[PDB]
Design a protein around this ligand. Structure first.
Ligand SMILES: CCCCCCCCCCCCCCCCCC(=O)OC[C@H](COP(=O)(O)OCCN)OC(=O)CCCCCCCCCCCCCCCCC
Ligand SMILES: CCCCCCCCCCCCCCCCCC(=O)OC[C@H](COP(=O)(O)OCCN)OC(=O)CCCCCCCCCCCCCCCCC
Ligand SMILES: CCCCCCCCCCCC(=O)OC[C@H](COP(=O)(O)OCC[N+](C)(C)C)OC(=O)CCCCCCCCCCC
Ligand SMILES: CCCCCCCCCCCC(=O)OC[C@H](COP(=O)(O)OCC[N+](C)(C)C)OC(=O)CCCCCCCCCCC
Ligand code: SF4
Ligand code: SF4
Ligand code: SF4
Ligand code: SF4
Ligand code: SF4
Ligand SMILES: [K+]
Ligand SMILES: [Zn+2]
Lengths: 321, 233, 115, 145, 192, 124, 88, 48, 69, 105, 136
C-alpha cells in the first residue's frame, strides 16, 4: 500500500502548510487511493487464502497486481515505490490515455472477484478454517485500539474515510461493510466487499474526473515547469531554492489519520519552523493488531495461529517502522 | 453481437481558461475551532484540579496534565458519557532537551461513539515516572514499550515493559536528540571467532551534514487569527 | 493478554531499604541459573566462571546513590535477567558479552597515532 | 448500477466462431471473460503573490490556561460582554446562571464531544439494492443515507 | 436542536433496523433435511469449485518468455543512472551540487573545480548504486538534464565493487544509452 | 612519456592515439583539470592486475569535442543568445555581451561567439 | 546536576571523558557539538576518495533555546564542555 | 485536447455487484440419480 | 494462443533451422515479420498472429545458440 | 496588505535583466537576491584582478563595490573585501571559483 | 534452481511476482523451498538489520554444499536507504559471501530474473570434476 502511505504524510504536511490541493489533484489521489487498496487487499486476502492452503487464488490475483502495477509505473516510473503523492498535490500529471486503460481493466476486473468468491466464499473447507476463529468483541476491539477491518468485523460501523473526509472522498459514494461475529470469515467478507466498493469508486473517479492543475501553483512548495524554469528568472530561483534548502513548515503539531488498507494509519509530526521535521511518529495499524495477538489467539490451535495472522494483514515493514 | 468501441476515438471536451480558487483553508474550520474550545473548557470545568491548560489547532484538541494527573484525566475521558474516548490510538513521545522535563508523552484517544479525538499531553523527565495507562487501555501495552525502548521513559505500572524495537542487548535509547543517527557500533562476521560479532562503528563514507546552508532569515510570521470571539477577553 | 515468563510490574519504589532487599534476591537469581546459562548458550566457560563474571558485574556498580536512579538500574537489570533467562539473546551475544577485554606511555601513543 | 454485463461489453479476449457457442454451453457463467486484455485496443499507442498565499496566514498557536479561562466567565466575551487567578476558587464562588450559558450549553446540558464530521449518518441497506451477499451471510452493508 | 440535552448526538443514533433479528432454529430452514444432506454428502460446492478451476485450464496463460520478450516500460521508468552529453560533445553537467543535496540516500558525490578552458565542470562524480534508492530526484533536479535514469535494469554484477559508478562509467552509459534516453525524454516532454 | 600524462595542459603537443590505453582519453593525452588524477596513475593499482584494460570505460574527452566545433558568429549585433540549441530540453537562456574583442564561450554549452566586424580579428 | 545520569543514557564511556562539547551560538539560539578527534576524524578512502570517519559524533548538533538550558543539559549528562561567548 | 480527460458521455457502467448464479439440478434430482445408479448397478451385479 | 494449431503454423513457416533454434532457447515455436537487426546481431521480430497475448507481440532471436544474455 | 506590493515591486524590478546563472553562480547558494526574492517577492513571472572574478552581468548595482573603495581601503591591499560585501554573485572570488557550495562547507 | 524464501522487506514483493503467472519462475525449474536443507540458493531480499544478522548466519551455514547467495536490492547490497541507521547492517556482504548483486529499489521482476540468469551462466561454467584431473 504505497500511495496510501505517502498520502498520510502528504496530508500531514499540507495540514501544517495551510495549503490545499486543487480539485484534479485530489481526484488523482482518490483514484490511486482505490487502486492501492485493491493492490493491498490482493496481497492480504490471497496470502491469507494461500497460508490456509488455497494456492490457486493467490496466482489468479497476482496477475491483476501485475496489471495494476502497470498503472503505478506509467504515472510515476517505478513499479512498486511510487514517490508520486508529494506534499502539495501529486508529482506529475496523468499520462494521456491512462483513464482509458484504467477503465478497461475495471470492466475485466469485475469477474476476477467472482472466481475468487467461487473457490473461497461458499467452500466448506474455507468456512471451517475461519468461522469462529479469532473472536474479537466490539467492546474489546476498542480497548486494544484496533482499526480497519478488525474493527468492523466486530460490528462497529466506523470508517475514517467518512469520519474525516479527505482528498475527494466526500465527492464519491460507496458503502462500508460491517460484520456481526468478529471472526476471520467475517473479516474475509468485509475485505471482499472492499474489493467491489473500491471498484465502484474507480468508476466514479474516472467519470467525475475534473480538469485543471495537479499540484498547488505555489512555486515555494512545488517545482516550476521546465518550460518555465529556463525562461523565467523567478521560476529558476524557486527551482534552485526548493532542491537545496527545501521549504519551511510553520511551527505546530498535527495528527492526521487516514483509512489505510490495514486500518487507521496516522503520523504525528511536529514542525519546528525548519525545513526538516522535528518529530515524526508513525501509527502503524499492523503494529497495534499484532499486540492484540495474545487476546485473540488464546485458546485456539496451532493451525488457527496462521489464520489469525493472515486476517491481521501483517506487513512487518510497517510494524517495525 | 456488436463490436466494442475504441476509447481513444471517443469525442472529448476541450478546456481552456482555468480559475482555480485560492482562499484560506482555515475558513472550513470556522465552526470546528468553535466547537472544540468549549469542549476543552468543559473538561477543565469537570476537571479544574488536573487540566493545566489546553489549545485547539484547527480540528484538534489538546489536554495538558501533569504525570500525577494523567490516569485521572484519562479515566474521566474514557468513562464519562459526555466524552467516551474508548480507544487509545497512539502513545508517542518526543525529546526537547532544553526543558527540565525534556520528553513530552502524548496520548491520542478515539471516540467511536461521539466521533472525535483528543490529545492528552503529559511531560516526563529522564527519571520522573509516568503512570501506565494499561488499567484503562490494554492497547498501550505495545505503544508504551516502543516509547520506553526509543526514549528510556520510565512508565509506572506497566505489566511488562522491555525492549520491543531495538536489538537484544542494545545500549542506549535511539530517538533522543543526543543519540547519534549512525549509532555507536555495527556488526560483522569474524571467521576466526566463527560468529557474528559487534564492533565499534566505522563508516567508509561519513554522513555529510548539509544543514549548514540553512535559512538565516525568517520564513513565517504570526499569521491570521481565527479564534472565535466567544473565547476572548 | 497474559504476561510472559519472569515478568514484574514497573513500579517507582519510594523506599531506600526495600530496594536493598530487592537487589539481594536478584543477585541470587542469577547465581541459581548459573548452570543453565552454560547449558542454554553452550558457553565455553564453566559454571564457576559465569558466577565469577556475574560477581564482577554485581560488584562493579554497588556504590550508586540516587534512589530515582536506583529504580532505573533495577528496572533495566530486571530486563537483562528476563531476556537471558527466557533464552532470548542469541548465542553470539552472550559469548561476546564475556569476551570483552593496562595503558601505554606517551611515546607509544605519539608514534602510532594516539586517538 | 453494477448489474451483470455480457462478455462482448468487456475489453477482453473473446471467442470467435462455433467455439463461442461451445463456451456458452460448458462454462457455468457465460458472461465472464478470460481476463486477457485486448491486444488491439489496450495500450496500443504507447506513451510515445499575496492574493494567492496562505502559508504565511496559517492559524496561530494560542494556549488557554487557568488564568485566562477564569476571565471568560467573569468579564464575559469579546462578542457578548458581561497573574495567577485560580479557577477552582472561581467555581466555588460564582453564579450558576453564568455556568448555564458559558461553561455549559443548552441549560447546563453537557457538551457532546464535537463531531469530526456531522454528516456521518448511516442507514441499513438491503440485498436488492447493493447486490452483495444475501441475508444469511454474517455481514451487513451500511451507506451514507 | 441537537441531542445535547440528553448528552447524545445524531451521530450516536444507530440507523433504523440496526439491531439483529432473531436467529433461526432447526425448524426454520428453507431447504428440507434431504436437500441439505444431498448437498452435504455429495460435495456440491467442491465439485462446482473444481469445475471453475477447470475453466482456467482452457484459457491462455499470461506468461511471457524472458529474456526473449520483455514486459512493458514507460517513458518515466527509473532505472540506471546515466550522465548525459550535449550534441556538440561538451558535458551537460556544470556541477551544481544540486545533485549532492537532493539525493535522499546521499548516493551522489561531486567534486569540481575550474577546467583548463575555465568553463565550470567536475572531475569527480560518483554514484553508490548500492546506496541509491532509484528515487528519481537525479533527473528532476537537473537544470540541464545532465543526469537521467535510463530504462535499463539488466546490469547485475558479480562483485559489489563494480556497482560504484565513477564519472567515466556514468559517461560511458550516457553515450551508450543516448538514443534510448531520446525516446524517454521526447515522450515525457509535455508533462514536465 | 611520463611527463605530459601526469600534467594538466591546454592542448597536447603530440598527436593522440585512440589505441593507447595509458592516455587520459582516446582523443587526449594530458588531463584537463589540475586535480584530476591521471589515468596512467590510476590503472597502476592492485585491482587492474588481471582485469583487461581494453574493456574499461574510456569515454572521449569533453574538452576536445567542443574545440572541434567552429565558432558561431553574430552579424550586426552585440548580444548573443544561446539556450542549448535544442529547444526546450536545453540550458537556461543566457545573453552574451560581445563588447570584448575575442571569443566568449557560452555559460553551459561552451559554444563561442563573435561579431561581424571582429570576424577577421578574432580568427587570427 | 548531582545525578549520575550517564548510567541510564547508555552512552559509551568515551563521551564522559575523552570528548569535548562546544556550546556556541551561530543568532537567537544556542547549539552543542563535539570537537573533532585528534586523528581518524577524516581519512581519505583509498578506493573512491570517500570522506571516511570513525568519529560517531561528527554529524550531531543539538539546537537549544537558552544558554542556561544548554548548560543544564551538559551537567545533567555529565559532559565536559566549554562555552563560547559571541562577539557583540 | 492537451490533457487526459474522460469523454463527455463518460464510459459505460462496469459490473461490480456480486454475480454468482447457481448451477446444476436440484439436490433431490441428484439424490434420485444416486439411487437409480445404485438401483441399476445392483441389477447388473445380480445378473452377473 | 497455446494450442497445437498455432505451434504447427509457426513451425511450418519458419522452417526447421530457425524453429529448432527456438526449440533450444525460446521453448515456444513462434513466427513473425522480421523488423531488422541491431549492431550486435540480434534479429527483432514482430508477430502478426491474432492469437498472441498482449505482451508477446514483439520478441527477439539472439545470435547465440546455447546461451542468451 | 498594501505594503507587501513594495517587496513585490522591488523584487520584480531587480530580476528584470538578471542572468539565469543560479546553477553556475560561484556563490549561488547564499546570495541575498534569491533568499530575498522568496520571502518577500512573488513567485511567477572586464576583469579587475587575478583575485576577484568580476561579472557585472549579475550586478544589481548599488555601487557598494564603489562606496567601500573610496571609504575604507582607498594595487589595493584590501580590495578583496569587495567580494564579501556585494550580496549578489556579481563579484565573486576567483581562487575559490567553481569549487564548493555553501550548503556543504 | 531452488532458492529459499528469505523475503524480509519491500524487496520481497518482487520476488513473489516472479512466481506470478506473468513470469512464472516455475517454468525455469525454480521451486522455492522453505527449509535451508532443501534449498541450494538463498535470495537475501530486504534490509538486514543488526537484530537479524546473527540469525541470517545460522540460516546460511545450514545449506549443504554447493550453495549460492544472491543479494537483491539496495539494502542487501550496501545498505541502501538505511545506510546511516543505528540498527541496519550496511550491506549483507559483511555476514555472508555473495555471488551476484541485483541493483534496484526494488529491482524489477525482470532484473531479478536477469540476476538469476547470470548466476546460472556461472554455474554452467563450473569445472569441479575436471579440476581434480588437471588442477589437483
Ligand atoms: C453404494 C450403495 C449406495 C449407498 C447409498 C444409497 C442411496 C440411497 C439412500 C437410501 C437411504 C436414504 C434414505 C432417504 C429417504 C428418507 C429421507 C427423508 O425422508 O428425510 C428424513 C425425514 C426428515 O423429514 P423432513 O424432510 O425434514 O420434513 C421437514 C422438512 N422441513 O425423516 C422422516 O420423517 C422420514 C424418515 C424415513 C425413515 C426411513 C428411511
Ligand atoms: C425391486 C424391483 C424388482 C427388480 C426387477 C426384477 C425382475 O423384473 O426380474 C428380472 C430378472 C428375472 O426376470 P425373468 O423372469 O427371468 O425374465 C423376464 C424377462 N422380461 O431378475 C434377475 O435375473 C436379477 C434380479 C434383479 C435384482 C434387482 C436388484 C435391484 C436392487 C435395487 C436397489 C435399490 C436401492 C435403493
Ligand atoms: C449415503 C450418501 C453417501 C455419500 C458418500 C460420500 C461422502 C463424502 C463425505 C461427505 C461429508 C462431508 O464432506 O462432510 C464435510 C466434512 C465435515 O463437515 P462438518 O464437520 O459436519 O461441518 C459441516 C456442518 N454443516 C452440516 C452445518 C454443513 O468436512 C469437510 O468439509 C470435508 C471435505 C472433504 C473434501 C474431499 C475432497 C475430495 C474430492 C474427490 C473428487 C475430486
Ligand atoms: C455424473 C455426475 C458426477 C458427479 C456427481 C456429483 C455432482 C455434484 C452434484 C451433487 C450435489 C447436488 O445436489 O448439488 C446441487 C447443487 C446446488 O443446486 P441448488 O443450489 O439447489 O441450485 C439452485 C437452483 N437451480 C437449480 C435453479 C440452479 O448443484 C450444483 O451446484 C452442481 C454443481 C455443478 C457442476 C457439477 C459437476 C462438476 C464436475 C465435473 C463433472 C462433469
Ligand atoms: S536516483 Fe535519487 S537516490 Fe538514486 S542517486 Fe539519484 S538522487 Fe540519489
Ligand atoms: S543537477 Fe545536472 S548539472 Fe547540476 S550537478 Fe546534477 S547532473 Fe550536474
Ligand atoms: S546572484 Fe543569486 S539570483 Fe543572481 S544568478 Fe547568482 S544565484 Fe542567481
Ligand atoms: S556591490 Fe554588487 S550589487 Fe552593488 S553596485 Fe557593485 S556589483 Fe552591483
Ligand atoms: S532496497 Fe528498496 S525495495 Fe529493497 S528492501 Fe531496501 S528499501 Fe525496500
Ligand atoms: K557575494
Ligand atoms: Zn549555450
Amino acid at each position: 500500500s504505497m500511495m496510501t502511505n505517502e498520502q498520510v504524510f502528504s496530508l500531514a504536511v499540507e495540514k501544517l502548510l495551510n495549503l490545499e490541493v486543487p480539485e484534479r489533484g485530489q481526484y488523482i489521489r482518490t483514484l490511486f487511493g482505490e487502486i492501492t487498496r485493491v493492490l493491498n487487499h490482493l496481497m492480504s486476502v490471497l496470502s491469507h487464502a494461500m497460508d490456509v492452503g488455497a494456492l490457486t487464488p493467490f496466482l489468479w490475483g497476482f496477475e491483476e497486481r501485475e496489471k495494476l502495477m502497470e498503472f503505478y509505473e506509467r504515472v510515476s516510473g517505478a513499479r512498486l515505490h511510487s514517490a508520486y503523492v508529494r506534499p502539495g498535490g501529486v508529482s506529475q500529471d496523468l499520462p494521456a490515455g491512462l483513464l482509458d486503460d484504467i477503465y478497461m481493466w475495471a470492466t475485466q476486473f469485475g469477474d476476477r472477484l467472482d472466481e475468487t468468491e467461487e473457490l473461497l466464499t461458499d467452500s466448506r473447507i474455507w468456512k471451517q478454517r475461519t468461522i469462529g476463529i479469532g473472536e474479537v468483541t466490539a467492546e474489546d476491539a476498542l480497548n486494544y485500539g484496533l482499526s480497519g477491518v478488525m474493527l468492523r468485523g466486530s460490528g462497529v460501523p466506523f470508517d475514517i474515510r467518512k469520519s474525516q473526509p479527505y482528498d475527494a472522498y466526500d465527492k464519491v459514494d460507496f458503502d462500508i461493510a460491517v460484520g456481526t461475529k468478529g471472526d476471520c470469515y467475517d473479516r474475509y467478507l468485509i475485505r471482499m466487499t472492499e474489493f467491489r466498493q473500491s471498484l465502484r469508486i474507480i468508476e466514479q473517479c474516472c467519470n467525475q474526473m475534473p480538469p485543471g492543475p495537479v499540484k498547488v501553483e505555489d512555486f515555494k512548495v512545488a517545482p516550476p515547469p521546465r518550460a518555465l524554469m529556463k525562461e523565467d528568472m523567478e521560476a529558476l530561483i524557486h527551482h534552485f531554492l526548493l532542491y537545496t534548502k527545501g521549504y519551511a513548515v510553520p511551527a505546530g503539531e498535527t495528527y492526521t489519520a487516514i483509512e489505510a488498507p490495514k486500518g487507521e494509519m496516522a503520523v504525528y509530526v511536529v514542525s519546528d519552523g525548519s525545513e526538516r521535521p522535528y518529530r515524526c511518529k508513525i501509527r502503524a495499524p499492523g503494529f497495534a493488531h499484532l499486540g492484540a495477538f495474545d487476546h485473540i489467539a488464546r485458546g485456539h490451535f496451532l493451525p488457527d495461529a496462521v489464520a489469525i495472522i493472515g486476517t491481521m494483514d501483517l506487513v512487518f515493514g510497517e510494524v517495525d517502522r | 453481437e456488436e463490436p466494442l468501441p475504441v476509447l481513444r476515438d471517443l469525442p472529448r471536451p476541450e478546456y481552456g481558461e482555468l480559475h482555480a480558487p485560492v482562499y484560506n483553508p482555515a475558513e472550513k474550520y470556522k465552526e470546528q475551532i468553535e466547537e472544540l474550545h468549549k469542549f476543552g473548557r468543559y473538561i477543565m470545568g469537570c476537571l479544574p484540579k488536573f487540566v493545566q491548560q489546553f489549545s485547539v489547532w484547527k480540528d484538534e484538541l489538546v489536554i495538558y496534565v501533569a504525570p500525577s494527573a494523567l490516569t485521572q484525566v484519562a479515566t474521566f475521558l474514557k468513562d464519562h458519557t459526555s466524552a467516551q474516548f474508548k480507544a487509545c490510538m497512539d502513545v508517542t513521545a518526543a525529546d526537547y532537551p532544553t526543558r527540565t522535563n525534556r520528553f513530552d508523552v502524548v496520548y491520542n484517544l478515539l471516540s467511536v461513539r461521539h466521533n472525535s479525538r483528543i490529545r492528552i499531553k503529559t511531560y516526563a523527565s529522564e527519571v520522573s515516572p509516568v503512570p501506565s495507562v494499561v488499567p484503562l487501555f490494554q492497547g498501550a501495552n505495545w505503544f508504551e514499550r516502543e516509547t520506553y525502548d526509543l526514549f528510556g521513559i520510565f512508565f509506572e505500572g506497566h505489566p511488562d515493559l522491555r525492549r520491543i524495537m531495538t536489538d537484544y542487548g542494545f545500549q542506549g535509547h535511539p530517538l533522543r536528540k543526543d543519540f547519534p543517527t549512525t549509532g555507536y557500533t555495527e556488526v560483522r562476521y569474524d571467521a576466526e571467532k566463527r560468529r557474528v560479532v559487534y564492533e565499534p562503528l566505522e563508516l567508509t563514507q561519513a554522513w555529510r551534514n548539509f544543514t549548514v546552508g540553512s535559512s538565516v532569515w525568517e520564513q513565517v510570521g504570526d499569521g491570521k487569527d481565527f479564534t472565535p470571539e466567544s473565547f476572548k477577553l | 493478554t497474559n504476561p510472559t515468563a519472569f515478568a514484574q510490574t514497573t513500579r517507582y519504589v519510594k523506599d531506600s531499604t526495600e530496594m536493598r532487599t530487592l537487589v539481594l534476591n536478584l543477585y541470587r537469581r542469577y547465581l541459581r541459573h548459573s548452570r543453565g546459562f552454560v547449558n542454554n548458550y553452550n558457553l565455553d566457560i564453566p559454571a564457576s566462571q559465569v558466577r565469577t563474571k556475574i560477581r564482577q558485574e554485581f560488584e562493579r556498580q554497588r556504590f550508586v546513590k540516587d534512589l530515582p536512579l536506583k529504580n532505573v538500574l533495577y528496572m533495566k537489570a530486571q530486563m537483562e535477567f528476563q531476556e537471558l533467562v527466557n533464552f532470548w539473546k542469541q548465542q553470539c551475544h552472550v559469548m561476546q558479552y564475556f569476551e570483552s577485554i593496562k595503558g601505554d606511555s606517551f611515546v607509544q601513543k605519539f608514534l602510532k597515532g594516539a586517538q | 448500477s453494477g448489474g451483470p454485463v455480457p462478455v462482448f461489453k468487456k475489453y477482453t479476449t473473446g471467442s470467435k466462431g462455433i467455439w463461442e457457442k461451445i463456451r456458452q454451453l460448458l462454462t457455468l457463467v457465460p458472461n465472464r471473460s478470460t481476463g486477457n486484455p485486448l491486444v488491439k485496443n489496450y495500450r496500443v499507442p504507447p506513451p510515445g503573490y499575496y492574493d494567492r498565499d496562505h502559508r504565511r496566514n496559517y492559524p496561530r498557536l494560542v494556549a488557554f490556561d487557568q488564568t485566562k479561562v477564569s476571565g471568560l466567565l467573569t468579564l464575559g466575551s469579546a462578542q457578548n460582554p458581561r497573574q495567577s487567578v485560580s479557577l477552582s476558587s472561581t467555581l466555588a464562588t460564582i453564579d450558576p446562571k453564568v455556568v448555564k450559558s458559558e461553561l455549559l450549553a443548552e441549560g447546563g446540558s453537557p457538551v457532546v464531544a464535537p463531531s469530526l464530521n456531522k454528516k456521518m449518518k448511516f442507514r441499513l441497506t438491503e440485498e436488492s439494492e447493493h447486490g452483495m451477499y444475501p441475508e444469511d451471510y454474517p455481514i451487513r452493508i451500511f451507506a451514507q443515507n | 436542536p441537537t441531542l445535547a440535552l440528553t448528552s447524545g448526538s445524531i451521530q450516536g443514533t444507530h440507523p433504523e433496523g440496526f439491531r439483529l433479528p432473531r436467529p433461526k432454529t432447526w425448524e426454520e430452514s428453507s431447504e428440507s433435511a434431504l436437500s441439505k444432506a444431498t448437498k452435504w454428502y455429495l460435495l456440491s460446492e467442491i465439485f462446482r469449485g473444481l469445475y471453475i478451476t477447470l475453466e482456467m485450464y482452457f484459457r491462455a496463460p499470461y506468461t511471457i518468455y524472458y529474456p526473449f520478450e520483455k514486459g512493458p516500460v514507460s517513458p518515466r521508468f527509473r532505472g540506471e543512472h546515466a550522465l548525459r552529453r550535449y550534441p556538440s560533445g561538451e558535458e551537460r553537467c556544470i556541477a551544481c551540487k544540486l545533485c549532492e543535496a537532493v539525493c535522499p540516500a546521499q548516493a551522489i558525490t561531486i567534486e569540481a573545480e575550474e577546467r583548463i578552458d575555465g568553463s565550470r565542470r567536475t572531475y569527480k562524480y560518483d554514484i553508490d548504486m548500492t546506496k541509491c534508492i532509484y528515487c528519481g530526484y537525479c533527473q528532476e533536479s537537473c537544470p540541464v538534464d545532465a543526469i537521467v535514469e535510463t530504462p535499463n535494469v539488466e546490469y547485475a554484477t558479480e562483485t559489489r565493487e563494480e556497482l560504484l559508478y565513477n564519472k567515466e562509467k556514468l559517461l560511458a552509459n550516457g553515450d551508450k544509452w543516448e538514443q534510448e534516453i531520446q525516446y524517454a525524454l521526447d515522450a515525457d516532454a509535455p508533462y514536465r | 612519456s611520463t611527463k605530459e600524462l601526469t600534467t594538466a595542459r591546454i592542448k597536447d603537443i603530440s598527436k593522440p592515439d585512440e589505441n593507447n590505453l595509458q592516455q587520459q582519453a582516446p582523443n587526449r593525452i594530458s588531463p584537463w583539470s589540475k586535480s584530476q588524477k591521471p589515468r596512467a596513475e590510476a590503472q597502476d593499482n592492485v585491482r587492474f592486475a588481471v582485469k583487461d584494460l581494453a574493456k574499461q570505460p574510456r569515454p572521449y574527452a569533453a574538452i576536445d569535442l567542443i574545440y572541434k566545433q567552429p565558432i558561431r558568429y553574430i552579424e550586426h549585433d552585440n548580444v548573443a543568445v544561446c539556450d542549448g540549441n535544442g529547444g526546450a530540453q536545453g540550458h537556461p537562456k543566457v545573453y552574451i555581451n560581445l563588447d570584448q574583442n575575442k571569443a566568449i564561450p557560452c555559460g553551459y554549452c561552451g559554444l563561442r561567439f563573435a561579431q561581424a566586424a571582429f570576424k577577421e580579428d578574432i580568427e587570427s | 546536576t548531582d545525578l549520575a545520569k550517564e548510567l541510564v543514557s547508555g552512552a559509551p564511556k568515551e563521551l564522559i571523558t575523552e570528548r569535548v562539547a562546544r556550546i556556541y551560538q551561530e543568532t537567537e539560539t544556542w547549539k552543542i557539538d563535539w570537537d573533532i578527534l585528534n586523528k581518524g576524524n577524516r581519512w581519505e578512502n583509498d578506493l573512491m576518495g570517500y570522506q571516511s570517519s570513525s568519529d560517531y559524533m561528527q554529524g550531531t548538533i543539538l539546537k537549544f533555546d537558552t544558554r542556561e538550558g544548554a548548560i543544564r543539559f551538559a551537567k545533567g549528562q555529565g559532559w565536559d564542555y566549554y562555552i563560547q561567548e559571541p562577539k557583540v | 485536447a492537451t490533457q487526459d480527460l474522460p469523454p463527455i458521455s463518460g464510459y459505460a457502467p462496469i459490473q461490480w455487484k456480486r454475480n454468482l448464479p447457481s448451477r446444476g439440478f436440484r439436490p433431490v434430482i441428484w439424490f434420485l440419480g444416486l439411487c437409480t445408479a445404485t438401483g441399476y448397478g445392483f441389477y447388473q451385479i445380480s445378473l452377473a | 494462443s497455446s494450442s497445437i494449431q498455432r505451434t504447427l503454423r509457426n513451425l511450418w513457416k519458419n522452417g526447421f533451422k530457425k524453429s529448432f533454434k527456438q526449440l533450444q532457447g525460446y521453448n515456444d515455436i513462434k513466427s513473425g515479420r522480421l523488423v531488422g537487426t541491431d549492431s550486435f546481431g540480434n534479429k527483432f521480430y514482430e508477430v502478426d498472429d491474432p492469437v498472441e497475448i498482449h505482451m508477446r507481440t514483439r520478441f527477439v532471436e539472439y545470435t547465440g545458440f546455447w546461451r542468451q544474455d | 496588505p498594501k505594503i507587501k506590493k513594495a517587496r513585490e515591486g522591488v523584487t520584480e524590478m531587480l530580476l528584470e535583466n538578471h542572468p539565469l546563472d543560479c546553477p553556475v553562480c560561484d556563490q549561488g547558494g547564499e546570495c541575498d537576491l534569491q533568499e530575498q526574492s522568496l520571502r518577500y517577492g512573488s513567485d511567477r513571472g572586464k576583469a579587475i584582478g587575478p583575485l576577484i572574478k568580476t561579472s557585472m552581468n549579475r550586478c544589481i548595482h548599488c555601487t557598494r563595490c564603489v562606496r567601500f573603495l573610496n571609504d575604507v581601503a582607498g594595487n589595493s591591499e584590501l580590495s578583496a573585501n569587495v567580494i564579501d560585501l556585494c550580496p549578489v554573485g556579481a563579484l565573486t572570488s576567483k581562487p575559490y571559483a567553481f569549487r564548493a557550495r555553501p550548503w556543504e562547507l | 534452481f531452488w532458492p529459499m524464501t528469505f523475503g524480509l522487506a519491500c524487496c520481497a514483493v518482487e520476488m513473489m511476482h516472479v512466481s506470478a503467472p506473468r513470469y512464472d519462475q516455475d517454468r525455469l525449474g525454480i521451486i522455492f523451498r522453505a527449509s535451508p536443507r532443501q534449498s541450494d540458493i538463498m535470495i537475501v531480499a530486504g534490509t538486514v538489520t543488526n537484530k537479524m544478522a546473527p540469525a541470517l548466519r545460522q540460516v546460511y551455514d545450514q545449506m549443504p554444499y554447493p550453495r549460492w547467495v544472491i543479494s537483491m536490492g539496495s539494502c542487501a547490497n550496501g545498505g541502501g536507504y538505511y545506510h546511516y541507521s543505528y540498527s541496519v547492517v550496511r550491506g549483507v556482504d559483511r555476514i555472508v559471501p555473495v555471488d551476484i548483486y541485483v541493483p534496484g529499489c526494488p529491482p524489477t521482476s525482470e532484473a531479478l530474473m536477469y540476476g538469476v540468469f547470470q548466476l546460472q551462466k556461472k554455474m554452467m561454467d563450473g569445472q569441479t570434476h575436471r579440476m581434480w584431473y588437471r588442477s589437483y
